[PDB]
Amino acid sequence: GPHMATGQDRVVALVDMDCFFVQVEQRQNPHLRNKPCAVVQYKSWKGGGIIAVSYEARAFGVTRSMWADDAKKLCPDLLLAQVRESRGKANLTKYREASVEVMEIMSRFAVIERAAIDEAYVDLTSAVQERLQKLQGQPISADLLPSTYIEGLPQGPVQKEGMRKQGLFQWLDSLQIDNLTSPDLQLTVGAVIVEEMRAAIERETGFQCSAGISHNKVLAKLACGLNKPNRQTLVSHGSVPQLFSQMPIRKIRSLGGKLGASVIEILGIEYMGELTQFTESQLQSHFGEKNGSWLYAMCRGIEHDPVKPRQLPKTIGCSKNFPGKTALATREQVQWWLLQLAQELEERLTKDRNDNDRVATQLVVSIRVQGDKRLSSLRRCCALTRYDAHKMSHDAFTVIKNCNTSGTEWSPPLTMLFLCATKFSAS
DNA sequence: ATTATGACGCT
DNA sequence: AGCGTCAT
Ligand SMILES: Nc1ncnc2c1ncn2[C@H]1C[C@H](O)[C@@H](COP(=O)(O)NP(=O)(O)OP(=O)(O)O)O1
Ligand SMILES: [Mg+2]
Ligand SMILES: [Mg+2]
How far is the CA of A387 from the C1' of B7 (A)? Predict the structure, then answer.
């Protein structure tokens, strides 16, 4: 009764850019705006691999991971923008910099956790509290929420904007606005703030985004995807039972892989809500103490993972695959590509040191061998004492050379190289 | 020949 | 420390 926590203590948003790399290229090249459009890396092999797709192109069935040549079969008028290529490899600098633009705007409103190049979590609890204190007894107008969906509404007694507004009206009509500690009210004020953040992002960058507002990161992330693009979705604690009743387990963050599959197989269920029928000890018994307790709370809409105060990446890496016949088979080849990777890594480390007052102290070198399906076949580290590309590539070769069975020749051929700078200290 | 690259858990 | 999992 009065002692069961309900996970309504926080307001958390997840903001995620709509077709991010495509919008970066469309801002730069107005000819691509409002068109079926995709971003591709490389070109020789089947026209290049697609990594981002405009919503106009998605309507034709173009998806991420598709070869551009195949995408053209689905969408003959597809426009393409190519990732910059430097030193023989794709270079993602333009998108990292555009990402920094967005994260810096978001960080004016609240502490953010950078969750990926185009998304960040926002802990709005304090901001909601402040805004409720200035704005006491003021009813919240639908005009303050022009792009907000309320998940689960309308219910009860033909066009999508009509539905959105009817749901929003039901929600606001039902609100108890003179209760400063009401969770539903807090979420609503959170959504007002997220509307403002999103307007600021679009004003100052040209980029559109979607957002989820809920009481934790998992629900905010799930909410965000419910009405992409260019919209935001509020998922309340009370909406959770119906929402989870038909929600495939795999749609919840961290359950999209083997663990989620095990939950489905061992328990013989399909939807997140079915998890409520198990005791905490049962879930721990199958999936471990940590996972069991997490699942027990998550299926009830309760999650406690904090929004970490971290706007900057914790590692700086460069990787390249060498698929099929292009696998690296000579010592010279391995060293040349280590140098290329190391030169890009140096350029990025030096900019990072000047911008963020920190220095990496460890270099992690990882490789994949022809035939091994695993992402990394071998990982080894060494000290990172100087931002010097020749030294870093030489040290990486020193740390991997004894993986070579026998040569001038390298065997088995290398299908991936990866250099990653880690363990930053302030400087 | 799904590429580049992040975060974090396990032992 | 090195490997595995999950993610965009
Ligand atoms: N598997 C992958 N490999 C490489 N780059 C990837 C990637 N997944 C994403 N990216 C890159 C390219 C993407 O532009 C960017 C953000 O990924 P999303 O947020 O998953 N997708 P987007 O923002 O494009 O569309 P939406 O509106 O549905 O959110 O990261
Ligand atoms: Mg996105
Ligand atoms: Mg994203």
Answer: 24
Q: How far apart are CA A287 and CA A71, in angstroms?
A: 40
Q: Tell how far CA A361 is from the center of its chain.
A: 26
* Domain total of chain A: 4
Give the method used. Answer: X-ray
Helices A20-28 and A93-106 cross at an angle (nearest 10°) of 100
Q: Which residue has the tokens 């805004």?
A: A131
Q: Are residues A284 and A173 in the same domain?
A: no
C-beta of residue A162 within 8 angstroms of C-beta of residue A149: no
List the one residue out of A261, A259, A384 whose CA is nearest residue A316.
Answer: A384
Q: Which of A275, A306, A337 is the last residue of a domain?
A: A306
Ligand 1 touching residue A50 (CB < 6 A): no
Question: Looking at ligand 1, which residue's alpha carbon is closest to its atom 23?
Answer: A19
* Residue A282 CB coordination number (10 Å): 14
Same domain, A332 and A426: yes
CA of A2 to C1' of B2 (A): 51
Helix (H) or strand (E) holding A287: helix A280-287
CA A177 to CA A150: how far, in whole Å? Answer: 17
Give the domain range for residue A411. 307-427
Residues A97 and A26 placed together within one structural domain of the fold: no
> Do A61 and A191 belong together in one domain?
no
Which ligand approaches the C-alpha of residue A22 most closely?
Answer: 1
Instruction: Select from A230, A248, A266 the last residue of a domain.
Output: A248
